[PDB]
Design a binder for this molecule. Sequence first.
Ligand SMILES: Nc1ncnc2c1ncn2[C@@H]1O[C@H](COP(=O)(O)OP(=O)(O)OP(=O)(O)O)[C@@H](O)[C@H]1O
Ligand SMILES: Nc1ncnc2c1ncn2[C@@H]1O[C@H](COP(=O)(O)OP(=O)(O)OP(=O)(O)O)[C@@H](O)[C@H]1O
Ligand SMILES: NCCNC(=O)C[C@](O)(CC(=O)O)C(=O)O
Ligand SMILES: [Mg+2]
Ligand SMILES: [Mg+2]
Lengths: 586, 578
Amino acid sequence: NRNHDVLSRMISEKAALHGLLNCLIKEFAIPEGYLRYEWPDEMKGIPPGAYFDGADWKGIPMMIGLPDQLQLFVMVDRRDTFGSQHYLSDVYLRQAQGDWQCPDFEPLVARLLAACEHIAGRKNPELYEQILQSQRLVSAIVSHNGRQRADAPLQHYLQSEQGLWFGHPSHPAPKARLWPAHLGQEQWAPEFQARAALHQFEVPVDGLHIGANGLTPQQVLDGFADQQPASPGHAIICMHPVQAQLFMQDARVQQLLRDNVIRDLGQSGRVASPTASIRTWFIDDHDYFIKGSLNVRITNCVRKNAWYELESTVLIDRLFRQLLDQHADTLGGLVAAAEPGVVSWSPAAAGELDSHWFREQTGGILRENFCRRTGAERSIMAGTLFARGVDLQPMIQTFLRTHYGEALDDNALLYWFDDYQTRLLRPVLSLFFNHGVVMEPHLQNSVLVHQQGRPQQVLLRDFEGVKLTDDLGIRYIDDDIHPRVRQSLLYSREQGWNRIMYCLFINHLSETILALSQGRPQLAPLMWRRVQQQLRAIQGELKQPSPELDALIAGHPVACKTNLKVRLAAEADRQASYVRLPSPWG
Amino acid sequence: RNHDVLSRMISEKAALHGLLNCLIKEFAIPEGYLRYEWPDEMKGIPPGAYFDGADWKGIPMMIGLPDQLQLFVMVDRRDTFGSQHYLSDVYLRQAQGDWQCPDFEPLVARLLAACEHIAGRKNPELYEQILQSQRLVSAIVSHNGRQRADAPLQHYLQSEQGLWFGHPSHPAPKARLWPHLGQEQWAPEFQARAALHQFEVPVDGLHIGANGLTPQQVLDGFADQQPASPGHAIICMHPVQAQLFMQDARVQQLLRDNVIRDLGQSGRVASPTASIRTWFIDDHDYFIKGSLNVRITNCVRKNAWYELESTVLIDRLFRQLLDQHADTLGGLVAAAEPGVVSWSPAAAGELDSHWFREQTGGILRENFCRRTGAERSIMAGTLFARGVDLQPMIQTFLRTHYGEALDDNALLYWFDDYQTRLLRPVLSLFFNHGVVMEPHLQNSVLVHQQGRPQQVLLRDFEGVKLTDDLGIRYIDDDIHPRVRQSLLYSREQGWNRIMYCLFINHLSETILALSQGRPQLAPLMWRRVQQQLRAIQGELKQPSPELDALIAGHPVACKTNLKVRLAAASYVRLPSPW
Ligand SMILES: Nc1ncnc2c1ncn2[C@@H]1O[C@H](COP(=O)(O)OP(=O)(O)OP(=O)(O)O)[C@@H](O)[C@H]1O
Ligand SMILES: Nc1ncnc2c1ncn2[C@@H]1O[C@H](COP(=O)(O)OP(=O)(O)OP(=O)(O)O)[C@@H](O)[C@H]1O
Ligand SMILES: NCCNC(=O)C[C@](O)(CC(=O)O)C(=O)O
Ligand SMILES: [Mg+2]
Ligand SMILES: [Mg+2]
């Protein structure tokens, strides 16, 4: 206590800062050539213990020269073309002709953001308050969770969803969840092991829109809510309780409640636990996750399911089922969580705009609870797998050492990594080049299934992000689908490849390698070399041309989605959503 | 980036740690200026100084100094003797200011001023001695960066050459002011070798002490006597002392008149040891110790006539005690000093005669490596020192010998064996015989068998004193009063030196070195000291009230090196570890 409060705070500040640094380095410093691995000519202001341990340098100096004559100095464990490194010192800043200084968290955040706002020519004070608000939540999170082993999040599936203490490791405000403050934060936060009874409404069956593959409409309904309380001619639907509050602000909803067309049944649904995506709920031993709309910003978008996404979910689920059934030999060993049921409600007499609004508000998706198959103690969300614990150390190190009974030598780490990366790259690249199916295989859409620590599967999830290429993938959907649903699913071959590149190498594998190679940066080139060899090998298996894979293998730059830059640039500035980072090889 | 900058930074950290040791032991602890507490206000202290990402980097230590000056540093342990590992840079704050981390020279200046204020006294040369000491350490680290950091522990002479940082609680451990002669040619830390300087002198001016050796054999131990003409002998000297010697008008006269002959650097090629003016020759029966008119740590390292005489008497006493009373000596291992030589003109007046004798003074020390083995014998100061990477060298030394990382019990058992072999002989000699050794780190040599402590050899008869109530009775009534005076300590003076040397200078450093990364082992080690003291007391043949009081947990005398140098040897008291 008290000492625990300062400590939790300092831990949250270091973690939040490291995420902000990640963004600065990946999105600005590297692509625009502001970064040098050099010592400042003058060090005044920087204390000897920042960079010298008594025998040797604490890693490699990193200097970033920014506008307004601002320079940043920090010590790092490695040079890395993707901006993946461990920071071995406090951040020092020097302004024009002043000395090096070490600012407190808020002033440091302010100055770094101001620098990026200068490069952008645009300020975003909302983002600034979100960075601070995210850090404050993380402080409460660390303070709440200082009880267990630092690697406890890796021991059970739900604990792995709950134990992403720090969130997206390269986002400026990973924990900012933008719903009315009076609704509270901790009540909804997997990081506080949140549980709640889902909110329920009773609605007339004539406004239901049910999508179902290998289930009856009634089984889809049952998957969300027990239908017993429903009167004849009605069904029960469920909703995030925050969403239900948002939903009921609307005049159209107020009118239906007043006219007794729908009934508000309160928080009377299944008691369930939010996962890391906040609006998807886990129930131990239920056949399904419940994914609902939440019309709120979390990281870089509003977490609502648009009507055409509710429609597209059904088609994509149907597609994956046919691919796994008839085309297993061109899917690279794909393991994916199905999304067999979708529900939404709108009043039957509603015009199109109101119908669409109602369907987005009430939209729900059933995802196969894979833990029934894979086992709760064998399944770990990959973001948490490659994350830092409450002690700010990669949790994977002790997880593996426990499972392997001993300290893993270089070979054991390389071998583990090889098993991990093949299971990720093969299904994704096979889907993309053979069938034009664009997954979004970032860390949160990926779940490691393991056997005594050893990788068996990388299960992939989230159909709502899945796209189909103009040249290959889009052929797989009917001619008679709504034009808007088609538009929703359609990506160019190039759009698809940019997303796959970022998700696979920068978001996912780069974090994999950084976590595994902590204390041993020399392993990173070797791991990336194994990736390059794996790509060459997958290319051999492919049934369709893969010129994109040629260029990547040949060392051409890799697309990197921005998380900070997008929030500074105009919404109309499409270019700011990506940058290019040098290849790990060449 | 450079090894030059790294070396400077290593030397500055070493030098500063040594200075903190003095501040904490000599001032902060006995005067109650020390608190293990966090400052209410941390502004200026960066997070990384005290916080590693998960926890605090040890324990905060605060010291309140004069004129509203405060010092902050993180340490690995609370320690009543002031023995801790420093885990952060030092931060200073004065008056209405923020915490600040000054460069080395500004830091030394501010800390020295504070100590000048607490002490009242000022030594104008000290500041420059501190800096010159740090600069030499920088050159030393720079030169010695190719070896395994624990190389100094592999061979006796390497242990003597490998005390890179010197006395660990001294403001200027490596301060040496040579008359245009260079540091490196005389520096053990640069593996220096030189032929000794030699003079042919007439035998009528010789003063030779000899025990178990003839006067001629003593002569032979210093120098091959073949080149000497009839009625003459060859003596040797430090080459630097030889140059200083010959700058004297009295000496130039004798040379001009051909009474003595300068034979140049024609003597034995030898290697200076850690003490600078004692030379080692592998394969020779003797070290050669000579006078040198240069200050090294606290003393100008020259030996006066009565000190030359007392060496002979002490050597004779140790032979008497071993011949007749070995069973009350506690397993004593000591390097004999069987020969002493000096020369002065036969005609000379007392004043001149004394000057010449001190100038030409020479002592033979038994080369114990002949019986203990060069690869088995390690000077204790180096054994418990930090290597060029500032890691305690004993950790890797022990690991290699035990074939594995030593667990807690292994360290504890090694320590127990070590401390018993130190404490027994020293306390037996003091209590049974009134003989006061000076068993500090440089006067002790571990003899080990595959790393297991066998004996702690003690040396340096010049340091040996005899108590007024017991030891001095071994001195015959026909001894010159000045020689008896040089030997005499009060029983209380004797005990304070023994206390300081055994527990604070020596075993505190032993424990600190062995227990890096494991501060919890310290009190356990200190508890074994206390148990061993009880055991030893039971063996004693004479009253030991002083030992009762020590076992009982009463304060321990600590010699003040910084104050000594500020003064240009008083004792403070430090709380018992038990
Ligand atoms: N490394 C990461 N990369 C991407 N998203 C991450 C990462 N770590 C945590 N997240 C979080 O996971 C969510 C990912 O968005 P995505 O659209 O893939 O999930 P969803 O559709 O909201 O939910 P589900 O995966 O349950 O369908 C976001 O809330 C994001 O903040
Ligand atoms: N921890 C230590 N305690 C005491 N002296 C030390 C220590 N470390 C290094 N020394 C050095 O060892 C010497 C100790 O002085 P002392 O008077 O015992 O030796 P000496 O008579 O000059 O030579 P010798 O020991 O060779 O006879 C000094 O040069 C001193 O700087
Ligand atoms: N006979 C006196 C000679 N003793 C020393 O010279 C030892 C010491 O005083 C150091 C010390 O005692 O800690 C020094 O100045 O290095
Ligand atoms: Mg997702
Ligand atoms: Mg000595």
